[PDB]
């Protein structure tokens, strides 16, 4: 119920970063931003608090919620994970602050985590403590956040979410296939980028936005069908990849997955490894949560009814990778390159949209748009 609410909140946050970057590559995690804020919730009280809550659709402290999230987090970092995905949250607050009695223990009760205490007077040190955290929890795949570049002696409250993903395909793409096809930018131009391709009966479906926009929706299962990569791209050119993401919801995906059908086709999908770091500040304000960032309006009295606090910096960084398989070796010169001929073929040579979801719960782990691989 929670994963479903957390999923939408994160998509709603994605729409923001998207609509804020026309014609631009962006990888983002609806789940991640959903988690951090679920925690930031406990620190916030009164005014500011409701903004977050209303915007998220649920109060973390209501019975059942928090534990639900703990559950989902665990099942994600489960056994199947197989080093394919990392995730992490973290709130840093000025140590010396008279935190409200029994807050930390409560926090740890619900999130099995602790609100990190650093001395922002040591700008060089703190700036590091933060980065070092993102490093030690993302398997080193994410060792530095550019945002910290702005932490200074006046910093009081910092929020962070970092994830790294590079799943292992259920059915890996033959290496002896990744040729160097051409890609059309929204720009109008083009570029020859590598594009792997495999022929199989991919779970396919054509979709139509409630306004005359027709996209192709494919589903690429990762090992054990635990996770799935959904790729959606319009038929014609011109058609704004925009249209979809605007009414893109946790429900919608379950709907594409609704009337799909395994069909024989040659899939040509560009390889791509993207990196994104968003300053959740404007995107979150656009969703109503504005008090948290305003100095004499923010209310974190639930955390420290002492000195005036406020989120001085909240951000997310996500490295996503799509390659032949989950990553294996290969021959250095393949003479042949065969495959059963298929009826139709799908060439993803225009900007497309992707979505990684945790099929069991439905969680929208990652989302993003590849405008130029």
mmCIF file of C-alpha atoms in Angstrom:
data_model
loop_
_atom_site.group_PDB
_atom_site.id
_atom_site.type_symbol
_atom_site.label_atom_id
_atom_site.label_comp_id
_atom_site.label_asym_id
_atom_site.label_seq_id
_atom_site.Cartn_x
_atom_site.Cartn_y
_atom_site.Cartn_z
ATOM 1 C CA UNK A 1 0.000 0.000 0.000
ATOM 2 C CA UNK A 2 3.027 2.090 1.063
ATOM 3 C CA UNK A 3 5.324 1.096 -1.761
ATOM 4 C CA UNK A 4 2.513 2.174 -4.035
ATOM 5 C CA UNK A 5 2.224 5.597 -2.336
ATOM 6 C CA UNK A 6 5.961 6.049 -2.119
ATOM 7 C CA UNK A 7 6.159 5.135 -5.815
ATOM 8 C CA UNK A 8 3.783 7.885 -6.956
ATOM 9 C CA UNK A 9 5.333 10.507 -4.711
ATOM 10 C CA UNK A 10 8.658 9.761 -6.387
ATOM 11 C CA UNK A 11 7.216 9.855 -9.900
ATOM 12 C CA UNK A 12 5.552 13.150 -9.051
ATOM 13 C CA UNK A 13 8.986 14.346 -8.003
ATOM 14 C CA UNK A 14 10.470 12.996 -11.241
ATOM 15 C CA UNK A 15 7.992 14.843 -13.390
ATOM 16 C CA UNK A 16 9.442 17.938 -11.787
ATOM 17 C CA UNK A 17 13.094 17.283 -12.618
ATOM 18 C CA UNK A 18 12.003 16.179 -16.083
ATOM 19 C CA UNK A 19 9.816 19.170 -16.867
ATOM 20 C CA UNK A 20 12.743 21.177 -15.569
ATOM 21 C CA UNK A 21 15.144 19.785 -18.148
ATOM 22 C CA UNK A 22 13.655 19.653 -21.635
ATOM 23 C CA UNK A 23 15.854 17.757 -24.096
ATOM 24 C CA UNK A 24 18.274 16.504 -21.429
ATOM 25 C CA UNK A 25 19.489 13.141 -20.046
ATOM 26 C CA UNK A 26 18.241 12.450 -16.495
ATOM 27 C CA UNK A 27 18.242 9.308 -14.340
ATOM 28 C CA UNK A 28 16.233 9.485 -11.121
ATOM 29 C CA UNK A 29 14.849 7.306 -8.323
ATOM 30 C CA UNK A 30 11.198 7.752 -7.291
ATOM 31 C CA UNK A 31 11.842 5.242 -4.527
ATOM 32 C CA UNK A 32 14.919 6.978 -3.160
ATOM 33 C CA UNK A 33 13.480 10.467 -2.826
ATOM 34 C CA UNK A 34 10.396 8.761 -1.372
ATOM 35 C CA UNK A 35 12.457 7.147 1.376
ATOM 36 C CA UNK A 36 14.564 10.089 2.557
ATOM 37 C CA UNK A 37 11.500 12.265 2.904
ATOM 38 C CA UNK A 38 9.652 9.550 4.799
ATOM 39 C CA UNK A 39 12.424 9.974 7.379
ATOM 40 C CA UNK A 40 12.722 13.713 7.084
ATOM 41 C CA UNK A 41 9.077 13.468 8.108
ATOM 42 C CA UNK A 42 9.831 12.402 11.633
ATOM 43 C CA UNK A 43 12.182 15.356 12.142
ATOM 44 C CA UNK A 44 9.589 17.820 10.903
ATOM 45 C CA UNK A 45 6.651 19.037 12.973
ATOM 46 C CA UNK A 46 3.646 21.312 12.587
ATOM 47 C CA UNK A 47 3.411 23.510 9.471
ATOM 48 C CA UNK A 48 6.303 22.176 7.397
ATOM 49 C CA UNK A 49 5.328 18.635 8.436
ATOM 50 C CA UNK A 50 1.934 18.657 6.834
ATOM 51 C CA UNK A 51 3.399 19.896 3.554
ATOM 52 C CA UNK A 52 5.533 16.786 3.329
ATOM 53 C CA UNK A 53 2.702 14.520 4.465
ATOM 54 C CA UNK A 54 0.038 15.939 2.162
ATOM 55 C CA UNK A 55 2.543 15.733 -0.694
ATOM 56 C CA UNK A 56 3.451 12.123 0.123
ATOM 57 C CA UNK A 57 -0.053 10.899 0.783
ATOM 58 C CA UNK A 58 0.768 9.309 4.146
ATOM 59 C CA UNK A 59 2.114 10.046 7.648
ATOM 60 C CA UNK A 60 5.157 7.961 8.517
ATOM 61 C CA UNK A 61 4.204 7.786 12.158
ATOM 62 C CA UNK A 62 0.831 6.191 11.488
ATOM 63 C CA UNK A 63 0.810 2.527 12.450
ATOM 64 C CA UNK A 64 1.928 0.129 9.750
ATOM 65 C CA UNK A 65 3.667 2.644 7.515
ATOM 66 C CA UNK A 66 7.242 2.714 8.798
ATOM 67 C CA UNK A 67 7.508 -1.066 9.217
ATOM 68 C CA UNK A 68 6.152 -1.516 5.722
ATOM 69 C CA UNK A 69 9.034 0.546 4.354
ATOM 70 C CA UNK A 70 11.532 -1.346 6.474
ATOM 71 C CA UNK A 71 10.159 -4.514 4.884
ATOM 72 C CA UNK A 72 10.533 -3.216 1.312
ATOM 73 C CA UNK A 73 14.038 -1.909 1.962
ATOM 74 C CA UNK A 74 15.067 -5.351 3.177
ATOM 75 C CA UNK A 75 13.538 -7.240 0.265
ATOM 76 C CA UNK A 76 15.452 -4.880 -2.040
ATOM 77 C CA UNK A 77 18.809 -5.422 -0.381
ATOM 78 C CA UNK A 78 17.806 -9.073 -0.392
ATOM 79 C CA UNK A 79 19.791 -12.138 -1.670
ATOM 80 C CA UNK A 80 18.721 -11.802 -5.309
ATOM 81 C CA UNK A 81 20.105 -8.259 -5.375
ATOM 82 C CA UNK A 82 23.449 -9.741 -6.366
ATOM 83 C CA UNK A 83 25.318 -6.387 -6.259
ATOM 84 C CA UNK A 84 22.975 -5.030 -8.910
ATOM 85 C CA UNK A 85 21.556 -2.234 -6.751
ATOM 86 C CA UNK A 86 22.600 0.059 -3.922
ATOM 87 C CA UNK A 87 20.510 2.529 -1.970
ATOM 88 C CA UNK A 88 21.023 4.883 0.935
ATOM 89 C CA UNK A 89 19.489 7.799 2.855
ATOM 90 C CA UNK A 90 21.005 10.057 5.509
ATOM 91 C CA UNK A 91 20.276 13.262 7.429
ATOM 92 C CA UNK A 92 23.115 15.273 8.912
ATOM 93 C CA UNK A 93 22.387 17.818 11.610
ATOM 94 C CA UNK A 94 24.710 20.070 13.629
ATOM 95 C CA UNK A 95 25.927 17.940 16.553
ATOM 96 C CA UNK A 96 25.806 20.529 19.353
ATOM 97 C CA UNK A 97 22.031 20.966 18.912
ATOM 98 C CA UNK A 98 19.750 20.294 21.871
ATOM 99 C CA UNK A 99 17.702 17.597 20.135
ATOM 100 C CA UNK A 100 14.269 16.909 21.568
ATOM 101 C CA UNK A 101 14.323 14.272 24.310
ATOM 102 C CA UNK A 102 14.066 10.723 23.012
ATOM 103 C CA UNK A 103 13.975 11.659 19.341
ATOM 104 C CA UNK A 104 17.017 9.689 18.172
ATOM 105 C CA UNK A 105 15.858 6.474 19.826
ATOM 106 C CA UNK A 106 12.418 6.949 18.246
ATOM 107 C CA UNK A 107 13.962 7.648 14.852
ATOM 108 C CA UNK A 108 16.069 4.486 15.113
ATOM 109 C CA UNK A 109 12.913 2.641 16.175
ATOM 110 C CA UNK A 110 11.207 3.264 12.807
ATOM 111 C CA UNK A 111 14.109 3.473 10.391
ATOM 112 C CA UNK A 112 16.864 1.261 11.892
ATOM 113 C CA UNK A 113 19.079 4.296 11.084
ATOM 114 C CA UNK A 114 20.399 7.299 12.976
ATOM 115 C CA UNK A 115 20.345 11.008 12.187
ATOM 116 C CA UNK A 116 24.026 11.709 11.493
ATOM 117 C CA UNK A 117 25.596 14.420 13.724
ATOM 118 C CA UNK A 118 28.472 16.426 12.220
ATOM 119 C CA UNK A 119 30.123 19.724 13.136
ATOM 120 C CA UNK A 120 29.502 21.969 10.152
ATOM 121 C CA UNK A 121 32.142 24.309 11.546
ATOM 122 C CA UNK A 122 34.644 21.920 10.015
ATOM 123 C CA UNK A 123 33.510 22.598 6.457
ATOM 124 C CA UNK A 124 36.339 20.584 4.960
ATOM 125 C CA UNK A 125 35.763 17.689 7.345
ATOM 126 C CA UNK A 126 31.958 17.622 7.189
ATOM 127 C CA UNK A 127 31.879 18.065 3.445
ATOM 128 C CA UNK A 128 33.926 14.844 3.507
ATOM 129 C CA UNK A 129 31.997 12.970 6.189
ATOM 130 C CA UNK A 130 29.004 13.344 3.932
ATOM 131 C CA UNK A 131 30.722 12.208 0.744
ATOM 132 C CA UNK A 132 32.467 9.383 2.555
ATOM 133 C CA UNK A 133 29.024 8.158 3.602
ATOM 134 C CA UNK A 134 27.643 8.042 0.096
ATOM 135 C CA UNK A 135 30.808 6.167 -0.811
ATOM 136 C CA UNK A 136 30.735 3.486 1.851
ATOM 137 C CA UNK A 137 27.074 2.674 1.167
ATOM 138 C CA UNK A 138 26.909 2.777 -2.614
ATOM 139 C CA UNK A 139 29.642 0.188 -2.849
ATOM 140 C CA UNK A 140 31.974 3.017 -3.791
ATOM 141 C CA UNK A 141 30.035 3.540 -7.014
ATOM 142 C CA UNK A 142 29.093 7.019 -5.788
ATOM 143 C CA UNK A 143 32.034 8.643 -3.981
ATOM 144 C CA UNK A 144 31.222 12.364 -4.102
ATOM 145 C CA UNK A 145 28.164 14.617 -4.311
ATOM 146 C CA UNK A 146 28.742 18.015 -5.927
ATOM 147 C CA UNK A 147 26.112 19.551 -3.700
ATOM 148 C CA UNK A 148 28.344 19.302 -0.632
ATOM 149 C CA UNK A 149 30.335 21.904 -2.494
ATOM 150 C CA UNK A 150 27.879 24.264 -0.755
ATOM 151 C CA UNK A 151 28.037 23.051 2.819
ATOM 152 C CA UNK A 152 29.568 25.761 4.991
ATOM 153 C CA UNK A 153 29.834 26.839 8.630
ATOM 154 C CA UNK A 154 26.233 28.066 8.632
ATOM 155 C CA UNK A 155 24.849 24.694 7.553
ATOM 156 C CA UNK A 156 22.433 23.136 10.046
ATOM 157 C CA UNK A 157 20.446 20.394 8.311
ATOM 158 C CA UNK A 158 21.423 18.303 5.250
ATOM 159 C CA UNK A 159 19.497 15.516 3.459
ATOM 160 C CA UNK A 160 20.942 12.906 1.033
ATOM 161 C CA UNK A 161 19.827 9.947 -1.127
ATOM 162 C CA UNK A 162 22.140 7.977 -3.384
ATOM 163 C CA UNK A 163 21.640 4.885 -5.508
ATOM 164 C CA UNK A 164 23.571 2.854 -8.046
ATOM 165 C CA UNK A 165 21.983 0.326 -10.391
ATOM 166 C CA UNK A 166 23.279 -2.056 -13.053
ATOM 167 C CA UNK A 167 21.043 -5.111 -13.152
ATOM 168 C CA UNK A 168 21.693 -8.552 -14.560
ATOM 169 C CA UNK A 169 19.485 -9.390 -17.547
ATOM 170 C CA UNK A 170 17.373 -12.522 -17.442
ATOM 171 C CA UNK A 171 18.201 -13.016 -21.126
ATOM 172 C CA UNK A 172 21.557 -11.290 -21.835
ATOM 173 C CA UNK A 173 22.191 -9.517 -25.165
ATOM 174 C CA UNK A 174 24.744 -11.331 -27.330
ATOM 175 C CA UNK A 175 27.943 -9.255 -27.360
ATOM 176 C CA UNK A 176 28.649 -10.273 -30.943
ATOM 177 C CA UNK A 177 25.696 -8.038 -31.784
ATOM 178 C CA UNK A 178 26.255 -4.601 -30.281
ATOM 179 C CA UNK A 179 26.888 -2.674 -33.476
ATOM 180 C CA UNK A 180 27.345 1.073 -33.709
ATOM 181 C CA UNK A 181 23.919 2.312 -34.945
ATOM 182 C CA UNK A 182 22.718 5.892 -35.395
ATOM 183 C CA UNK A 183 20.616 7.849 -32.868
ATOM 184 C CA UNK A 184 18.309 10.853 -33.558
ATOM 185 C CA UNK A 185 18.326 13.600 -30.896
ATOM 186 C CA UNK A 186 15.252 15.710 -30.161
ATOM 187 C CA UNK A 187 17.714 18.372 -31.207
ATOM 188 C CA UNK A 188 17.263 17.188 -34.779
ATOM 189 C CA UNK A 189 20.859 16.097 -35.193
ATOM 190 C CA UNK A 190 22.124 12.521 -34.808
ATOM 191 C CA UNK A 191 25.012 10.500 -33.339
ATOM 192 C CA UNK A 192 26.421 7.013 -33.765
ATOM 193 C CA UNK A 193 26.348 5.390 -30.370
ATOM 194 C CA UNK A 194 26.711 1.694 -29.585
ATOM 195 C CA UNK A 195 23.399 -0.243 -29.634
ATOM 196 C CA UNK A 196 23.106 -3.830 -28.440
ATOM 197 C CA UNK A 197 20.308 -6.012 -29.763
ATOM 198 C CA UNK A 198 18.676 -9.380 -29.221
ATOM 199 C CA UNK A 199 15.813 -11.241 -30.848
ATOM 200 C CA UNK A 200 13.255 -12.874 -28.575
ATOM 201 C CA UNK A 201 9.534 -12.793 -27.811
ATOM 202 C CA UNK A 202 9.663 -9.637 -25.655
ATOM 203 C CA UNK A 203 6.594 -8.806 -23.584
ATOM 204 C CA UNK A 204 5.192 -6.022 -25.774
ATOM 205 C CA UNK A 205 2.283 -3.556 -25.948
ATOM 206 C CA UNK A 206 1.331 -0.374 -27.760
ATOM 207 C CA UNK A 207 0.018 2.379 -25.518
ATOM 208 C CA UNK A 208 -1.957 5.564 -26.104
ATOM 209 C CA UNK A 209 -1.927 8.589 -23.808
ATOM 210 C CA UNK A 210 -5.430 10.032 -23.200
ATOM 211 C CA UNK A 211 -4.565 12.622 -25.867
ATOM 212 C CA UNK A 212 -3.568 10.923 -29.129
ATOM 213 C CA UNK A 213 0.020 9.964 -28.303
ATOM 214 C CA UNK A 214 1.168 6.447 -29.235
ATOM 215 C CA UNK A 215 4.164 4.823 -27.557
ATOM 216 C CA UNK A 216 5.740 1.404 -27.660
ATOM 217 C CA UNK A 217 6.068 -0.228 -24.279
ATOM 218 C CA UNK A 218 8.508 -3.126 -23.832
ATOM 219 C CA UNK A 219 9.523 -5.053 -20.760
ATOM 220 C CA UNK A 220 12.978 -6.462 -20.241
ATOM 221 C CA UNK A 221 13.095 -8.869 -17.255
ATOM 222 C CA UNK A 222 16.238 -8.898 -15.108
ATOM 223 C CA UNK A 223 17.373 -12.263 -13.647
ATOM 224 C CA UNK A 224 14.751 -14.122 -11.649
ATOM 225 C CA UNK A 225 12.092 -11.739 -12.945
ATOM 226 C CA UNK A 226 12.641 -9.893 -9.652
ATOM 227 C CA UNK A 227 13.206 -6.599 -11.433
ATOM 228 C CA UNK A 228 11.989 -5.351 -14.810
ATOM 229 C CA UNK A 229 13.199 -2.653 -17.155
ATOM 230 C CA UNK A 230 10.345 -1.033 -18.998
ATOM 231 C CA UNK A 231 11.181 0.959 -22.089
ATOM 232 C CA UNK A 232 8.694 3.309 -23.681
ATOM 233 C CA UNK A 233 9.206 5.358 -26.841
ATOM 234 C CA UNK A 234 6.837 7.088 -29.292
ATOM 235 C CA UNK A 235 6.153 5.740 -32.808
ATOM 236 C CA UNK A 236 6.789 8.864 -34.913
ATOM 237 C CA UNK A 237 9.449 11.496 -34.231
ATOM 238 C CA UNK A 238 8.300 14.917 -33.028
ATOM 239 C CA UNK A 239 6.033 13.233 -30.446
ATOM 240 C CA UNK A 240 7.311 14.650 -27.114
ATOM 241 C CA UNK A 241 8.635 11.878 -24.866
ATOM 242 C CA UNK A 242 7.089 14.394 -22.501
ATOM 243 C CA UNK A 243 3.442 13.337 -22.982
ATOM 244 C CA UNK A 244 3.943 9.989 -21.272
ATOM 245 C CA UNK A 245 5.870 11.124 -18.143
ATOM 246 C CA UNK A 246 3.152 13.733 -17.446
ATOM 247 C CA UNK A 247 0.488 11.149 -16.618
ATOM 248 C CA UNK A 248 3.077 8.558 -15.735
ATOM 249 C CA UNK A 249 1.901 6.839 -12.551
ATOM 250 C CA UNK A 250 2.518 3.765 -10.443
ATOM 251 C CA UNK A 251 -0.805 2.595 -11.800
ATOM 252 C CA UNK A 252 0.065 3.211 -15.474
ATOM 253 C CA UNK A 253 3.006 0.813 -15.371
ATOM 254 C CA UNK A 254 0.818 -1.907 -13.890
ATOM 255 C CA UNK A 255 -1.471 -1.121 -16.793
ATOM 256 C CA UNK A 256 1.147 -1.458 -19.500
ATOM 257 C CA UNK A 257 2.069 -4.729 -17.811
ATOM 258 C CA UNK A 258 -1.662 -5.217 -18.077
ATOM 259 C CA UNK A 259 -2.249 -5.987 -21.758
ATOM 260 C CA UNK A 260 1.258 -6.896 -22.894
ATOM 261 C CA UNK A 261 2.030 -9.985 -24.959
ATOM 262 C CA UNK A 262 5.241 -11.855 -25.578
ATOM 263 C CA UNK A 263 5.976 -11.373 -29.298
ATOM 264 C CA UNK A 264 8.889 -12.241 -31.575
ATOM 265 C CA UNK A 265 11.005 -9.202 -32.476
ATOM 266 C CA UNK A 266 14.526 -7.880 -33.016
ATOM 267 C CA UNK A 267 15.223 -5.438 -30.220
ATOM 268 C CA UNK A 268 17.817 -2.760 -30.883
ATOM 269 C CA UNK A 269 18.474 -0.844 -27.672
ATOM 270 C CA UNK A 270 21.377 1.602 -27.215
ATOM 271 C CA UNK A 271 23.751 0.844 -24.346
ATOM 272 C CA UNK A 272 23.885 3.679 -21.825
ATOM 273 C CA UNK A 273 25.489 4.535 -18.485
ATOM 274 C CA UNK A 274 24.106 7.715 -16.994
ATOM 275 C CA UNK A 275 24.737 9.782 -13.885
ATOM 276 C CA UNK A 276 22.460 12.414 -12.359
ATOM 277 C CA UNK A 277 22.476 14.658 -9.299
ATOM 278 C CA UNK A 278 19.447 16.799 -8.589
ATOM 279 C CA UNK A 279 19.057 19.529 -6.002
ATOM 280 C CA UNK A 280 15.612 18.428 -4.793
ATOM 281 C CA UNK A 281 15.004 21.992 -3.564
ATOM 282 C CA UNK A 282 12.889 23.449 -6.397
ATOM 283 C CA UNK A 283 11.299 20.136 -7.368
ATOM 284 C CA UNK A 284 10.047 19.659 -3.782
ATOM 285 C CA UNK A 285 8.811 23.231 -3.484
ATOM 286 C CA UNK A 286 6.813 22.716 -6.673
ATOM 287 C CA UNK A 287 5.101 19.865 -4.833
ATOM 288 C CA UNK A 288 4.222 22.176 -1.947
ATOM 289 C CA UNK A 289 6.972 21.359 0.533
ATOM 290 C CA UNK A 290 8.443 24.852 0.763
ATOM 291 C CA UNK A 291 8.622 25.644 4.466
ATOM 292 C CA UNK A 292 11.341 23.069 5.071
ATOM 293 C CA UNK A 293 13.753 25.142 2.974
ATOM 294 C CA UNK A 294 12.779 28.568 4.394
ATOM 295 C CA UNK A 295 14.833 29.714 7.413
ATOM 296 C CA UNK A 296 12.174 31.424 9.515
ATOM 297 C CA UNK A 297 9.297 29.193 8.429
ATOM 298 C CA UNK A 298 10.811 25.710 8.543
ATOM 299 C CA UNK A 299 9.674 23.642 11.494
ATOM 300 C CA UNK A 300 11.871 20.805 12.733
ATOM 301 C CA UNK A 301 10.755 21.268 16.336
ATOM 302 C CA UNK A 302 10.106 17.527 16.425
ATOM 303 C CA UNK A 303 13.888 17.123 16.121
ATOM 304 C CA UNK A 304 15.308 20.146 17.852
ATOM 305 C CA UNK A 305 12.966 22.742 19.305
ATOM 306 C CA UNK A 306 16.154 24.651 20.012
ATOM 307 C CA UNK A 307 18.011 26.719 17.406
ATOM 308 C CA UNK A 308 16.039 27.622 14.253
ATOM 309 C CA UNK A 309 16.576 24.779 11.787
ATOM 310 C CA UNK A 310 15.814 24.177 8.132
ATOM 311 C CA UNK A 311 16.978 21.911 5.289
ATOM 312 C CA UNK A 312 19.992 23.735 3.964
ATOM 313 C CA UNK A 313 20.577 21.151 1.257
ATOM 314 C CA UNK A 314 18.634 18.094 0.096
ATOM 315 C CA UNK A 315 19.742 16.081 -2.916
ATOM 316 C CA UNK A 316 19.826 12.745 -4.773
ATOM 317 C CA UNK A 317 22.518 11.212 -7.023
ATOM 318 C CA UNK A 318 21.922 8.146 -9.192
ATOM 319 C CA UNK A 319 24.259 6.173 -11.486
ATOM 320 C CA UNK A 320 22.357 3.828 -13.814
ATOM 321 C CA UNK A 321 23.902 1.269 -16.187
ATOM 322 C CA UNK A 322 22.512 -0.665 -19.117
ATOM 323 C CA UNK A 323 24.846 -3.000 -21.035
ATOM 324 C CA UNK A 324 24.787 -6.399 -22.792
ATOM 325 C CA UNK A 325 24.150 -8.530 -19.725
ATOM 326 C CA UNK A 326 24.591 -7.754 -16.060
ATOM 327 C CA UNK A 327 28.255 -7.673 -17.100
ATOM 328 C CA UNK A 328 30.266 -10.656 -18.422
ATOM 329 C CA UNK A 329 33.430 -11.040 -20.562
ATOM 330 C CA UNK A 330 33.492 -11.741 -24.316
ATOM 331 C CA UNK A 331 35.416 -12.748 -27.457
ATOM 332 C CA UNK A 332 37.616 -10.012 -28.984
ATOM 333 C CA UNK A 333 36.754 -10.829 -32.623
ATOM 334 C CA UNK A 334 33.542 -12.711 -33.447
ATOM 335 C CA UNK A 335 33.464 -13.965 -37.041
ATOM 336 C CA UNK A 336 29.757 -14.788 -37.085
ATOM 337 C CA UNK A 337 26.664 -12.978 -35.784
ATOM 338 C CA UNK A 338 23.557 -15.108 -36.330
ATOM 339 C CA UNK A 339 20.031 -15.148 -34.919
ATOM 340 C CA UNK A 340 16.571 -16.386 -35.862
ATOM 341 C CA UNK A 341 14.884 -13.935 -38.208
ATOM 342 C CA UNK A 342 11.889 -12.282 -36.523
ATOM 343 C CA UNK A 343 8.618 -10.825 -37.936
ATOM 344 C CA UNK A 344 8.982 -7.196 -36.920
ATOM 345 C CA UNK A 345 11.879 -5.384 -35.296
ATOM 346 C CA UNK A 346 11.891 -2.515 -32.825
ATOM 347 C CA UNK A 347 14.616 0.071 -33.157
ATOM 348 C CA UNK A 348 14.961 2.389 -30.166
ATOM 349 C CA UNK A 349 16.866 5.129 -31.989
ATOM 350 C CA UNK A 350 14.982 8.133 -30.634
ATOM 351 C CA UNK A 351 14.966 9.488 -27.099
ATOM 352 C CA UNK A 352 13.166 6.958 -24.929
ATOM 353 C CA UNK A 353 11.899 6.532 -21.430
ATOM 354 C CA UNK A 354 12.832 3.788 -18.967
ATOM 355 C CA UNK A 355 11.507 2.446 -15.673
ATOM 356 C CA UNK A 356 12.981 -0.130 -13.307
ATOM 357 C CA UNK A 357 10.412 -1.573 -10.950
ATOM 358 C CA UNK A 358 10.545 -4.109 -8.140
ATOM 359 C CA UNK A 359 7.896 -6.416 -9.617
ATOM 360 C CA UNK A 360 7.002 -8.099 -6.309
ATOM 361 C CA UNK A 361 5.943 -4.905 -4.507
ATOM 362 C CA UNK A 362 5.477 -2.754 -7.594
ATOM 363 C CA UNK A 363 7.939 -0.149 -6.370
ATOM 364 C CA UNK A 364 9.256 2.160 -9.068
ATOM 365 C CA UNK A 365 12.947 1.795 -8.156
ATOM 366 C CA UNK A 366 14.357 3.935 -10.991
ATOM 367 C CA UNK A 367 13.005 6.158 -13.701
ATOM 368 C CA UNK A 368 14.587 8.395 -16.301
ATOM 369 C CA UNK A 369 14.868 9.610 -19.850
ATOM 370 C CA UNK A 370 17.683 8.890 -22.292
ATOM 371 C CA UNK A 371 17.799 11.853 -24.655
ATOM 372 C CA UNK A 372 21.224 10.907 -26.013
ATOM 373 C CA UNK A 373 23.012 7.658 -24.999
#
